């Protein structure tokens, strides 16, 4: 599969295309339309998908390593299972998405929409979820150890059975109005 490298695509409409099994290295997709597109078994190293739409697309069985997804929309995207290593989802829309058991360890999820998102059993270690919207989000049995979250996260997300660290347990109590004394 011919490797795409060091190319920019700007405002390009791909809805007409099969993009299954494509391999990109340092390719920048700016405001491109991937609605309904097959992107399955594709491979991306240092590529950027910024302010793109993945509405009703398939990216399952793909690998994204050190990629940007900044501002991209994943509404009704077939995502899982998938590999993301150290990807930036800043300001992306993942509302209602099925991300069950997906590993987003060390990923930036700053100001992401996860409204109604299913992250049951998701692995989120050392991820940054600051400013993210988690109204109705299902985090049951997720691994949250080391994950940076706003205090409201603890009164908003469904976290029954989630794994957390000592610092997070103290924030959980403070978020529910307990006054914790270290002394």
């Amino acid at each position: 599969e011919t490797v795409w490298a060091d190319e920019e695509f700007a405002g390009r409409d791909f809805r007409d295309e099969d993009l299954s099994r494509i391999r990109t290295e340092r390719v920048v997709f700016t405001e491109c339309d991937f609605s309904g597109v097959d992107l399955s078994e594709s491979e991306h190293h240092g590529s950027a998908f910024r302010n793109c739409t993945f509405r009703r697309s398939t990216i399952w069985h793909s690998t994204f390593t050190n990629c940007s997804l900044l501002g991209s929309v994943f509404t009704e995207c077939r995502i899982r299972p998938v590999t993301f290593v150290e990807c930036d989802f800043t300001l992306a829309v993942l509302g209602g998405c099925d991300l069950r058991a997906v590993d987003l360890s060390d990923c930036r999820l700053r100001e992401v929409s996860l409204v109604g998102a299913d992250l049951r059993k998701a692995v989120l270690r050392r991820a940054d979820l600051t400013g993210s919207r988690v109204q109705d989000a299902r985090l049951e049995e997720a691994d949250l150890r080391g994950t940076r979250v706003d205090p409201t996260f603890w009164t908003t997300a469904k976290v029954r059975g989630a794994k957390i660290d000592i610092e997070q347990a103290l924030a959980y109590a403070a978020a529910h109005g307990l006054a914790v004394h270290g002394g």
Partner: protein, 345 residues
């Protein structure tokens, strides 16, 4: 303190090794040797100046006052069934021992012009849940120390088979430059250069190494007197403010960013940044009960001042690389503004 698990056991090692590294930072030690012996003792040797040997005010030799009364290696002595110090100083070899911190009589050996210190301690198994040190942990910490002390070779030998040894040598003549090369190994630099500069103030010094990669993450590592300030602090805030100013000024000067456009944010400019910031502070001040955050007020403006001068210089001298780095931050800034406008509508 520490804890009484892997975190605390290892802190014994860090306390002895730190005293060796202090000699290095003072320009007197060049070599630190660390051995994990088959008996579970740890031996640390340095070619420093030696722990002082002569009679203190206390009414006991200065080494004894270093090993018994707290506020240092005292913590190690107190948590060890035995400690042994061999010191080369004042033209003689010396040997002193401690059994549960109770000193023996300092003994004078033969003459030597050589100077240095060797500390061997046996962690108390009645205090620590596990006395079983982790080679990979120790090696990762000593490698880090070697990156931060250019002129220093650190040798590690583990003699425990769970007779073959596990051996490592950590020597990085490039210092922070080698650290950045290590950080950027698995990434793609977008500039041939590694940026390296330093500044000297009264009661403080700073060294910075940095190089941009093609990636979308920030890998910036911060140190105050050799310690890893994991929660960051005033040296990192100094650095951040100076980098944001220099790149905005330059982007405007070279017209890579329109007069009327908003400033680049730190998120935009530090996308793909590998950097190390090492500060020295005569009188350090730490925040949080973690104690991993530098709070020294005057370090912010010191670091900011130095970075402003040295980054201006570098951006001015290196137009082709500067353009690549500013264009990367401009394209990032345009995606972040478009993402936010589309989320708020």
């Amino acid at each position: 303190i520490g804890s009484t698990g892997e975190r605390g056991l290892h802190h014994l090692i860090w306390e002895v090794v730190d005293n060796a590294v202090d000699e290095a930072m003072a320009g007197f030690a060049t070599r630190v040797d660390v051995k994990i012996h088959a008996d579970g003792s740890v031996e640390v040797r340095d070619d420093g100046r030696g722990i002082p040997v002569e009679m203190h005010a206390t009414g006991m030799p200065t080494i004894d006052v270093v090993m018994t009364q707290l506020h240092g290696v005292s913590v190690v002595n107190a948590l060890s069934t035995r400690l042994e110090a061999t010191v080369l100083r004042d033209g003689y070899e010396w040997f002193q021992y401690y059994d549960r911190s109770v000193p023996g009589k300092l003994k004078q050996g033969g003459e030597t012009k050589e100077t240095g210190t060797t500390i061997r301690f046996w962690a108390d198994p009645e205090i620590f849940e596990t006395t079983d040190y982790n080679f990979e942990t120790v090696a990762r910490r000593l490698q880090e120390m070697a990156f931060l002390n250019k002129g220093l070779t650190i040798e590690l030998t583990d003699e425990r088979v769970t007779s073959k040894v596990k051996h490592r040598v950590f020597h990085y003549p490039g210092g922070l430059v080698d650290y950045v090369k290590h950080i950027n190994r698995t990434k793609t630099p977008i500039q041939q250069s590694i940026i390296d500069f330093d500044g000297k103030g009264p009661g403080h010094e700073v060294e910075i190494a940095m190089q941009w990669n093609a990636g979308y993450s920030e890998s910036v590592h911060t140190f105050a007197n050799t310690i890893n300030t994991h929660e960051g602090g005033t040296h990192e805030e100094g650095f951040r403010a100076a980098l944001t100013s220099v790149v905005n000024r330059y982007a405007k000067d070279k017209k890579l960013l329109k007069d009327k456009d908003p400033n680049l944010t730190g998120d935009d400019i530090r996308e793909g940044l590998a950097a190390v910031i090492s500060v020295k502070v005569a009188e350090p001040q730490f925040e949080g009960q973690t104690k991993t955050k530098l709070g020294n007020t005057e370090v912010k403006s010191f670091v900011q001042k130095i970075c402003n001068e040295q980054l201006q210089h570098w951006f001015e001298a290196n137009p082709a690389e500067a353009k690549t780095v500013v264009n990367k931050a401009v394209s990032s800034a345009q995606a972040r503004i478009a993402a936010r406008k589309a989320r708020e509508l």
